Amino acid sequence: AHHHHHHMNCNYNCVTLHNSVRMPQLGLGVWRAQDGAETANAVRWAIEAGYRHIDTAYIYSNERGVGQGIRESGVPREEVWVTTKVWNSDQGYEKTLAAFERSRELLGLEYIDLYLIHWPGKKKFVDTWKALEKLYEEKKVRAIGVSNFEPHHLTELFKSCKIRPMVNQVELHPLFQQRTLREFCKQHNIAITAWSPLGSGEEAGILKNHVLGEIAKKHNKSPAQVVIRWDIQHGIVTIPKSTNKGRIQENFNVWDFKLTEEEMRQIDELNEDKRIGADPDNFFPGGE
Numbered sequence: 001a002h003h004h005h006h007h008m009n010c011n012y013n014c015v016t017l018h019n020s021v022r023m024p025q026l027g028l029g030v031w032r033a034q035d036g037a038e039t040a041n042a043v044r045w046a047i048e049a050g051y052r053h054i055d056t057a058y059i060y061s062n063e064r065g066v067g068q069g070i071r072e073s074g075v076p077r078e079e080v081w082v083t084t085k086v087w088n089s090d091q092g093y094e095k096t097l098a099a100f101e102r103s104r105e106l107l108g109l110e111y112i113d114l115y116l117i118h119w120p121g122k123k124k125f126v127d128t129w130k131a132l133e134k135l136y137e138e139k140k141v142r143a144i145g146v147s148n149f150e151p152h153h154l155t156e157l158f159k160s161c162k163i164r165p166m167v168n169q170v171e172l173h174p175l176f177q178q179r180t181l182r183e184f185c186k187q188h189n190i191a192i193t194a195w196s197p198l199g200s201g202e203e204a205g206i207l208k209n210h211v212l213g214e215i216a217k218k219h220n221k222s223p224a225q226v227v228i229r230w231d232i233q234h235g236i237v238t239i240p241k242s243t244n245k246g247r248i249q250e251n252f253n254v255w256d257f258k259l260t261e262e263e264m265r266q267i268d269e270l271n272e273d274k275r276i277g278a279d280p281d282n283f284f285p286g287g288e
């Protein structure tokens with residue numbers, strides 16, 4: 001039904017963007033999922049489990065697999081939110097319009113829900129943003145935003161834009177809690193999506209943290225479920241990645257418990273401002 005396009009009767013919550021679009025608060029990330037079957041299966045399994053939001057990017061090389069999983073699921077496309085991103089090499093007005101068309105074609109879609117500037121770089125994000133504004137005017141995209149932007153990048157963009165970014169997708173997990181950027185984005189009504197919400201694997205050690213383990217035990221949930229619920233209760237969109245059917249299902253089962261104020265505080269206090277992923281200041285491979 002059309003109401004499913006607006007995520008009205010469903011188990012998951014949404015965050016509302018400044019243009020009144022409702023964005024599902026939990027999605028499936030697909031970075032490092034191989035194109036073809038691995039991605040298609042992950043996406044299909046996520047949709048079967050109840051997910052209605054997939055996060056991909058041109059540079060993940062698996063937009064084909066994402067669209068294949070959506071089609072294989074049989075769920076009407078209007079009920080699913082798809083995010084993708086313009087890569088560094090495609091920044092600049094005309095290159096961004098072209099990159100969008102390529103992504104839309106690979107995905108097999110008539111429109112994309114959210115299109116993001118993937119990394120700021122230094123010199124082309126303003127012109128890139130103008131292309132996103134054009135795509136939005138043309139109704140090719142339902143929402144437009146950025147990723148890995150710091151307050152200084154956003155302030156610079158604000159001086160030139162007609163439509164302010166609706167989303168900023170940034171690294172955010174219990175060791176790197178982005179307090180300053182979150183304050184800035186709250187002030188200016190820019191929704192935050194957390195990438196590497198689980199720390200991007202075992203190296204970072206988040207899922208073995210003792211505090212998370214104790215909270216998990218109290219709720220008979222897993223540490224991953226606790227982290228995802230912490231994201232939810234902070235009003236953050238979260239896009240945990242798994243290619244494993246069981247873990248995909250586990251990460252969705254977060255709507256039937258609540259963390260207390262004290263549990264939320266305990267997780268907040270894990271912050272070390274320890275960045276696990278790439279730094280917006282110097283990560284811009286592939287610029288042209």
Ligand SMILES: NC(=O)c1ccc[n+]([C@@H]2O[C@H](COP(=O)([O-])OP(=O)(O)OC[C@H]3O[C@@H](n4cnc5c(N)ncnc54)[C@H](OP(=O)(O)O)[C@@H]3O)[C@@H](O)[C@H]2O)c1
Nearest residue numbers: 029030031055195196197198199200201224240241242243
């Ligand atoms: N905008 C950007 O610049 C940017 C950058 C990085 C990431 N992202 C997006 O954010 C998404 C999420 O971040 P991420 O992929 O870096 O990592 P993540 O979601 O923080 O962690 C994924 C890792 O955790 C494992 N895992 C997932 N669920 C689990 C569970 N319940 N129990 C135990 N282990 C679990 C996964 O293994 P299995 O797959 O084997 O389950 C994988 O090794 C990406 O996929 C991508 O969509 C965006």
